Amino acid sequence: MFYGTVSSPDSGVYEMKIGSIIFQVASGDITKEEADVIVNSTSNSFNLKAGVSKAILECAGQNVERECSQQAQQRKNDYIITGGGFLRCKNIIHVIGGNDVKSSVSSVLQECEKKNYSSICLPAIGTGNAKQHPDKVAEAIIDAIEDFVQKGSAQSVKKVKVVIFLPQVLDVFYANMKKREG
Numbered sequence: 001m002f003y004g005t006v007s008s009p010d011s012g013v014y015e016m017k018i019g020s021i022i023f024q025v026a027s028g029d030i031t032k033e034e035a036d037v038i039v040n041s042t043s044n045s046f047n048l049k050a051g052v053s054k055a056i057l058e059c060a061g062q063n064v065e066r067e068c069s070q071q072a073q074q075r076k077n078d079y080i081i082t083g084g085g086f087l088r089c090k091n092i093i094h095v096i097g098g099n100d101v102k103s104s105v106s107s108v109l110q111e112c113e114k115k116n117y118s119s120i121c122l123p124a125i126g127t128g129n130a131k132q133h134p135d136k137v138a139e140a141i142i143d144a145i146e147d148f149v150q151k152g153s154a155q156s157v158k159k160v161k162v163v164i165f166l167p168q169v170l171d172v173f174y175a176n177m178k179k180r181e182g
């Protein structure tokens with residue numbers, strides 16, 4: 001009762017509608033993207049600097065690193081919201097790669113509605129240091145967006161894009177989109 005048709009609007013980009021939201025996937029370096037929010041997949045200490053967390057903390061800068069450590073030593077956080085530093089975004093949301101991916105994406109969507117944001121870009125959360133299986137991660141990300149739409153929670157959020165470091169993981173996301181398409 002939600003899914004549109006899978007097509008390719010731009011070279012290496014695949015998209016489909018999920019209710020009112022445009023869902024897109026592509027391979028590349030997430031630190032070159034522009035969006036209201038960029039998501040970082042990190043450790044429970046919010047100081048991982050390996051794979052996607054290395055590229056995001058390096059390009060964001062030491063002021064963002066300081067924000068992460070300052071919030072980390074204040075309370076036990078499921079995720080942390082910082083400034084964008086030198087990334088092309090308004091905020092970074094740092095989620096824990098080992099946590100339930102559906103719950104992490106649900107939290108990102110709810111925080112973006114609170115700020116009246118329209119665009120989100122995320123990595124294949126948990127497929128790096130956390131070593132979660134790509135097929136399970138794709139199913140969880142798309143399930144979170146479906147639930148958000150079903151509950152009537154999508155109002156400001158219009159575009160959710162997954163930018164994926166390995167082309168082989170992109171192929172798993174595209175197969176999941178084709179499974180669901182109307």
Ligand SMILES: Nc1nnc(-c2ccc(O)cc2)s1
Nearest residue numbers: 051052053055127128165166
């Ligand atoms: N096995 C891997 N999963 N993630 C990787 C990654 C992601 C973003 C980067 O900027 C660099 C490496 S390698």
Ligand SMILES: [Cl-]
Nearest residue numbers: 097126128130
């Ligand atoms: Cl990860």
Ligand SMILES: [Cl-]
Nearest residue numbers: 123124164165
């Ligand atoms: Cl990725």
